[PDB]
Structures are given as C-alpha cells and as structure tokens.
C-alpha cells in the first residue's frame, strides 16, 4: 500500500588519510537501488537493483554529477562543523543525512523528511511542514539562520513534493514485481530444555518482505513483553528478512504460551504454538 524513498549520506573525515569519504545509498522501502562511494576506483552513481538498470545515460551522469557536488559540499560541511564546535583538525568526525518521501496507495505525498546528524547526534531537521527547521543546539542554529536566509526549506519542499514523489512512483512501476510484492513470513516454534524445569520456546519468522513485522509471546493470553528476548530484524541476503522471539517457560506449561505474528503479507495475524 504505502511506500517510501530514502537517501542516506555518510561523510567521514579522516585526518592524515586524505579527503573525507562520502558514501550515498538510495532505498525504496527496504530495497537498496543505488550507491555512490567517493572511495571507488571510478566514483559513480551505480545500480544496486535490477529495475533501475533500464535508466539511461542521462540519469546516471546527472546522478553522478549530483553526488560529486554533494560530496564536495559535505567535505566543506565537515570543515565548518569543526569551527562550530571549537574542535581540532586532528580528530575524525561524521556527518549523516537521511531524506526522502512517503506516499500512500494513491501515490500522493504522505510526508517528507530531511534530517541531519553530526557525530551520531541530531543536528538539524526539516519539520513536517516542510517550511521550518528544528536545530538541536546553537551551532545548528547558525546553520538554521543560514538556511532561512537562503530559503532552503522552499527548495527542499519543491523537491519532496515534486521530483521525489514522481520518481518514487516511476520506480514503484518499473519494479512492481518486487517493490509491490509482500512475502509473508515462514513461521515455526522450536523448544529447547535448559534444565529439568525450564525450557526455551523460540518463535521464528523467515523469508519475509518488507522488514516490518511484529512477533509477540503471550502466556495465558497476556503479552510477555518484559520476559521476551527479541532479536533485531536481520537481512537474509536475498532481499528477505528474519526475526525471532524467545521466552523461558516452566516445564509442563508450554501449551499456555502462544506466538503471535503480524506482517503485511499475511491476510490475518498468525497464532502458533509449540507442536511436540
């Protein structure tokens, strides 16, 4: 139904080891489709999904130009950030940026994003109105005053409402076989005794797309959030994802536990239990 496009920039300085590395990746939902790395033998925006390969030379050349311009801009931004935080030129620092658009089933803009960080912390974010800024500290306030003077928010709004949504629609159409296909989880429950009176029940979800999923354990119909071990959703490497949730239960009480699975590819939420 709903979809997103997101670009992620990482600019990392490295004193004594050349100019800052700039790496950009683009995603539609949980599918990466482009990359740029300033450390590549010949840096260019390059395809990472089959449905983007059909785009012609004007696309790839334009995108490469934009990425090199961006790399220059963010090397400069690292230099500026040093001054804003009274920092020495000897340390390594990182600027991160994530931006993009969310659209609904009818392809219309749900909302836009443009958020930046410095050394892992919030720096400045475009507000949901796409016209004002939230700065995390006084340095970012300097940047904010600059962007207000230059009406940068207006240009960003123009991009997010225009090109971002239009090209996202285009990508969704060219890659509809995959981008518009949800793969439901393959689910099962495993049982491993740990002692004579306790056992681990582990609820598995495999091979699902997109990554969004909910796995919960219930005991006698009550959620066991505090007692559940939940691993981070992880990529399988074939576009799909994996996750599990585990609970330690008293021996002989296994049937009082049920695993509940929610995913977009499932018409209804699943309930499963250990089947000895």
């Amino acid at each position: 139904g709903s979809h997103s496009m997101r670009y992620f920039y990482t600019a990392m300085s490295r004193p004594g080891r050349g100019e800052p590395r700039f790496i950009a990746v683009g995603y539609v939902d949980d599918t990466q489709f482009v990359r740029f790395d300033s450390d590549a033998a010949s840096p260019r925006m390059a395809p990472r999904a089959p449905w983007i390969e059909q785009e012609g030379p004007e696309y790839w050349d334009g995108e490469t130009r934009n990425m090199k311009a961006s790399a220059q801009t963010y090397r400069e931004n690292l230099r500026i950030a040093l001054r804003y935080y009274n920092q020495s030129e000897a340390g390594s620092h990182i600027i991160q940026v994530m931006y993009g658009c969310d659209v609904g089933p009818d392809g219309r803009l749900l909302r836009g994003h443009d958020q930046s960080a410095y050394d892992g912390k919030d720096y400045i974010a475009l507000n949901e109105d796409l016209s004002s800024w939230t700065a995390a500290d006084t340095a970012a306030q300097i940047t904010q005053r600059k962007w207000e003077a230059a009406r940068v928010a207006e240009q960003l709004r123009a991009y997010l409402e225009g090109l971002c949504v239009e090209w996202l629609r285009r990508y969704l159409e060219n890659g509809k076989e995959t981008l518009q296909r949800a793969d439901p989880p393959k689910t099962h429950v495993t049982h491993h005794p740990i002692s004579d009176h306790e056992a681990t029940l582990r609820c598995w979800a495999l091979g699902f797309y997109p990554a969004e999923i909910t796995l919960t354990w219930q005991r006698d119909g009550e959620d066991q959030t505090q007692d559940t071990e939940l691993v981070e959703t992880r990529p399988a490497g074939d576009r799909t994802f994996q996750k599990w949730a585990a609970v330690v239960v008293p021996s002989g009480e296994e049937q009082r536990y049920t695993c509940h699975v929610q995913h977009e590819g499932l018409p209804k939420p699943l309930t499963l239990r250990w089947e000895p």
Binding site: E63, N66, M67, A69, T73, N77, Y99, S116, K146
Partner: peptide, 9 residues
C-alpha cells in the same frame, strides 16, 4: 532520484 538542493552548513 536524489535531491539537487545544496545544503551548506
């Protein structure tokens, strides 16, 4: 398609 907007800090 990436953003063409320049963001100088």
């Amino acid at each position: 398609l990436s953003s063409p907007v320049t963001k100088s800090w």
